[PDB]
Symmetry: C2
Subunit: 614 residues, 2 copies
């Protein structure tokens, strides 16, 4: 039949719509057959049985609104860290193996959205490392060159996406594990705001810091996965937290992007070139780039490394370690790290927690006037043998830019910046404050269109395919709004010189209806260099339908918007064509009752009129 390697989610959905339930089952059965487990393919700890593929697919057929399921019959991989009930969970530790009787909340959500889990994916043992070599199941290679490391700890999940077996996969990230493998494999790596994705059914390893993360080939698919898994789960995950309403969806073109004053490369010469060029490209989107001392952030990173956070991994594994399981089941570097936790008492954990809170005061003072950090994802592209030689120091260095994100309650999106001379990829990570995940996506989109002009952007190993349409975003869905419905008629319309005031207050365009038959529109005597209309509700009988744009203005922001609204205008209510009332600009009678006032109703809107002039 037909090749499936490197399909977007959209590619998969298109197939399903135009195919029959049996010929789409076959395509997945066929994808499943081409995969190999165990040591043959180090990327897979385990793969589903054909019976299980049938089961998932039957369940899928029972649901009665497919073609509204944004991941209908789309295959996905899951880090062997995260429970799927159809397969065992291992944490890349053969004797730790266990059978979950229930799905991760995250997996359960993706299944509800129509996806099919194909296998569990290999990782550094107990999700401990940035290298991907620390698994008794095998070392996963870089999708581009088998001499190189895939990155970890989410190594299987990057590999599998990088070569387009599957268009989305799940990883986890405490201090880099969803970001480093994206850079080494030409992927999108989304590390969401903490507590946004539930960690119910993931094996705890630094519970207080840990996030479920996603890999994708493109912005579009990372967005669909985010919308699917961003769901509260307060009573079953102690660190879950609900996204607030009115999430920002775009940074201003003007945004302050901070970069570090000192960028250590540890001898590496190719990667600096990609970073320099990437910063040039951000400047060209119109961003303000500001160079900033990252001292406090690095103090925070050191606090991670010096502190007792290792006691979190130890807490999740000590009962198990005391079981004394066969040495061959264990990675020794991992186990030595985890046992570093024994030398810390409760008093110690607190002492470091104090120091962490103190650093954060400094970190919060620093970020107050910055919108985003742009950081190299990792300094190196490690060779398999380089990390065999120095099995700890390579790891430390690969966390140069990753270690402080979760401690500081930030979000992050690792995104390609191009290729070095030797044809390996790397890239940048963009770090935003709590709940900016949607705006980071969009910022990547804007970065891409400059760094990869003329649709020249590659993805995964697919060095000779180009992104056309797949990096486009819907933005946050209307579900998430909670604001006043506001109708504008004048200088706040798209394209006129007060539109920005709506953007400043994080307004969202809803629609463009007309008033009912009840309205006149005036042009007022110009005084500023801006001309200003006023609406008049009338009932002699002689009104027209005036044209409007309607915006949702977040409740907490409406104060900021109305404060910019000078006499004689005001905010009242207006009647739309359909009979709904909606807040709107109005005008004191004194306003349109001056010498200089011009009856503009004729034009049916304010645009038409500001063109019959200029």
């Amino acid at each position: 039949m037909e090749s499936t390697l490197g399909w977007s989610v959209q590619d998969w959905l298109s197939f399903h719509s135009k195919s029959t339930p049996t010929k789409s089952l076959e395509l997945l059965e066929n994808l499943l057959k081409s995969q190999k487990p165990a040591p043959e393919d180090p990327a897979w700890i385990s793969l589903i049985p054909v019976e299980d593929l049938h089961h998932q697919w039957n369940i899928l057929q029972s649901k009665s609104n497919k073609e509204e399921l944004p991941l209908y019959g789309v295959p996905i991989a899951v880090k062997d860290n995260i429970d799927y009930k159809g397969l065992p969970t291992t944490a890349a530790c053969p004797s730790y193996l266990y059978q979950p009787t229930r799905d991760s909340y995250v997996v359960e959500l993706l299944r509800d959205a129509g996806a099919v889990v194909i296998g569990k994916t290999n990782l550094d043992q107990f999700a401990t490392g940035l290298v991907g070599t620390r698994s008794p199941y095998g070392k996963t290679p870089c999708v581009f060159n088998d001499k190189y490391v895939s990155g970890g700890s989410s190594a299987g999940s990057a590999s599998v996406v990088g070569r387009g077996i599957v268009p989305l996969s799940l990883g986890t990230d405490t201090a880099g594990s969803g970001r480093v493998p994206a850079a080494l494999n030409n992927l999108i790596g989304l590390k969401p705001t903490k507590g946004a994705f539930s960690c119910r059914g993931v094996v705890p390893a630094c519970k207080s810091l840990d996030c479920v993360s996603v890999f994708a080939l493109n912005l579009s698919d990372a967005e669909i996965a985010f919308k699917v898994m961003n769901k509260p789960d307060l009573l079953e995950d102690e660190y879950s937290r609900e996204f607030p309403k009115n999430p920002i969806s775009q940074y201003p073109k003007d945004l302050t992007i901070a970069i570090p004053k000192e960028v250590p490369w540890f001898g590496e010469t190719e990667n600096p070139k990609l970073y320099t060029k990437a910063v040039a490209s951000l400047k060209n989107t119109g961003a303000k780039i500001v160079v900033v001392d990252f001292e406090p952030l690095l103090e925070l990173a050191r606090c991670l490394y010096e502190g007792a956070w290792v006691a979190e991994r130890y807490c999740a594994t000590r009962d198990f370690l005391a079981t004394n399981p066969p040495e061959s089941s264990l990675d020794e570097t991992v186990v030595n790290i985890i046992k570093g936790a024994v030398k810390f008492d409760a008093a110690d954990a607190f002492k470091f927690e104090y120091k962490r809170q103190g650093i954060l005061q400094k970190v919060n003072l620093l970020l107050k006037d910055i919108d985003v950090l742009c950081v190299p994802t990792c300094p190196l592209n490690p060779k398999l043998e380089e990390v065999a030689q120095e099995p700890v120091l390579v790891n430390s260095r690969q966390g140069t830019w990753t270690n402080f994100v979760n401690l500081a309650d930030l979000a992050a999106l690792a995104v390609p910046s191009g290729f070095r001379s030797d044809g390996l990829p790397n890239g940048i990570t963009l770090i935003g404050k709590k709940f900016s995940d949607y705006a980071l996506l969009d910022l990547a989109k804007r970065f891409f269109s400059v760094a990869f002009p003329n649709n020249s952007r590659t993805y995964g190993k697919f060095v000779d395919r180009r992104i056309t349409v797949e990096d486009e975003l819907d933005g946050p869905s209307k579900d998430t709004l909670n604001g006043v419905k506001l109708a504008v008629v004048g200088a706040h319309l798209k394209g006129l010189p007060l539109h920005w005031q709506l953007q400043k207050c994080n307004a969202t365009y809803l629609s463009s209806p007309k008033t009912s038959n009840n309205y006149k529109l005036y042009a007022l005597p110009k005084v500023g260099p801006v001309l200003k209309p006023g609406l008049r509700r009338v009932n002699d009988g002689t009104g027209s339908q005036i044209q409007l744009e309607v915006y949702s203005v977040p409740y907490d922001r409406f104060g900021d918007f109305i404060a910019m609204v000078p006499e004689p205008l005001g905010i009242g209510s207006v009647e739309l064509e359909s009979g709904e009332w909606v807040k709107s600009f109005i005008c004191e009678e004194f306003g349109y009752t001056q010498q200089g006032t011009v009856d503009i109703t004729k034009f049916g809107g304010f645009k038409p009129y500001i063109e019959h002039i200029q």
Copy 2:
């Protein structure tokens, strides 16, 4: 003579008197005080020359009568640094000499106050009893067979006897609350992070609060305003209060009381609680009966769990010097030494459990403005504590020990006397930053529970509060909002005024428009009559009375959602020429049949009165 004076009493003496007489008054006060053990309440008193030094510094300040604590004597817990006295934490061998004031003492000093002494406490602030000190066991201000309570023992006694009208305590698990109940005081336990902890000895650093004992609400408030200041770089748990702090709960607010109230045998204190609840009901407040189990789960955590290690963290380099056994209190040191039981791994295990409980607590409190709780179950005897050095202490903790873990604010307030003559009280608990609304809720509770100006204070069973529980609310520098003129149903006393309170609006003034304005009564549809303002291009316009309010930027959206056709918010020009947001009205509004031109009345209230 000076005993039982309030802050205002001190201020009014000073402002009528010479610096010299003012000094003598303070001197006589200092003279008449004794340190421990003659008086267990005081660990040390300032030497007379320190008094003069402090006085001379005060004389240097150029604006004196702006200073809200000018020449006002205060006590400080021997937990907190004042540079002219040593710090001890009630451990003689722990004694050190600070270089500088704690930030909190420095703020109060800048506000005028004179530190008179360092006050006695349970050693290393561990306990709610007051008795675990080698400098002595501070007695209840009512009866020296009874415990004063702790750990802010001396602070409570000194204010109970009215030597000083304010004292600093600290509070991690009740230490600013229990002693207030047992001595007929107000105990304020501010929102975490509001009062800096720079220069206080840590004992449970991540939960610690500096706190305040007063005799009346006014003083608690004054003190609160002086010390509620950020100190972000010198105190890792400092946090800035946001703008527009609420000043008052609605008449309506929901107050939760526990479904299960254990008393441990006590027969007297339940009657005062019952009575207090009935007083709250009578203020207009809706009482709901609520399952406190997850809050008591939380509070256990503090005891069974790893927070005990914060104390050990604070205290262990010292303890490894094996100081003399007789400077140590055995109960306390053993409680602290129990921290060796816990791994870092254990500390995280407990932290997860805490975060799990807080998910349940935060959900349970979305519905609720305030928790009302018995301050402590018991009025323990010294003897009872001697027999049960651990048991009584923990029963005294049954209501106190979840507050900081859960990041809440508290105010312990009197509720009357048992038949006994011993006092007790209620602690009102609110969410973060509610400190001003908590004080106002106490005012309201007082006016029902102690009608006709009958409230007692401290040992002063024969005096009555008069004006000293009144409040200024947050000061104007706290607000950040849009100035808004109302002309209509949102005026004070009028039917829509609740909508300003709902949006946390603050009254600023009652100015008039310029003479540019007409006012119409709109046709009456609802059972609410509403006016419409109209500006004219003259000459006919007249001046309309307004009320102007600060509406938080935050809340303005909430406010406008309540404003229907044909009204709107635009701007109006005051008599002063200042423009300001206000209600305006569509043309159509005042052009309907039945609109009455009402200008002649000068405003809306006089018109409503010409109808009734």
